[PDB]
Paper text:
Recent findings revealed that TNIP1 functions as a checkpoint mechanism that fine-tunes the rate of mitophagy by disrupting the recycling of the ULK complex during autophagosome formation. The phosphorylation of the TNIP1 FIR motif enhances its binding affinity for FIP200, enabling TNIP1 to compete with other autophagy receptors, such as CCPG1 or Optineurin. Here, we determined several crystal structures of the FIP200 claw domain in complex with phosphorylated TNIP1 FIR peptides and elucidated the specific recognition of different phosphorylated TNIP1 by FIP200 claw domain. Each FIP200 claw domain within the dimer features a five-stranded antiparallel β-sheet and a short α-helix.
Numbering used by the authors:
A (entry chain A): 1491 to 1543, 1550 to 1591
B (entry chain B): 100 to 109
Amino acid sequence: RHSEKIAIRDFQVGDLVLIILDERHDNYVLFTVSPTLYFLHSESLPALDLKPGSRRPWVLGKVMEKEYCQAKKAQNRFKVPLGTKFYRVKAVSWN
Amino acid sequence: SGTSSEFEVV
């Protein structure tokens, strides 16, 4: 409980993270002070009780994996330009 | 696919 504080950068396995809906990018992201987008991995949505697509505004999660990615087409599910680098993060519920 | 067309791991 004392170690339950939300990480804000350099996300590591085991970090507590605040996962928030980002309407502009049509996806859940991690709250961060990084300039880089950290998207929630699509495989993590069911176990966080989240849905694809009135979506729940936030959940608290625990980081399981991080993956560095780059958009290869101008039209993509993350609504970022061609060449944008971003992360995908797998997370499970903090509870 | 469409997904791996859109983005990749780097």
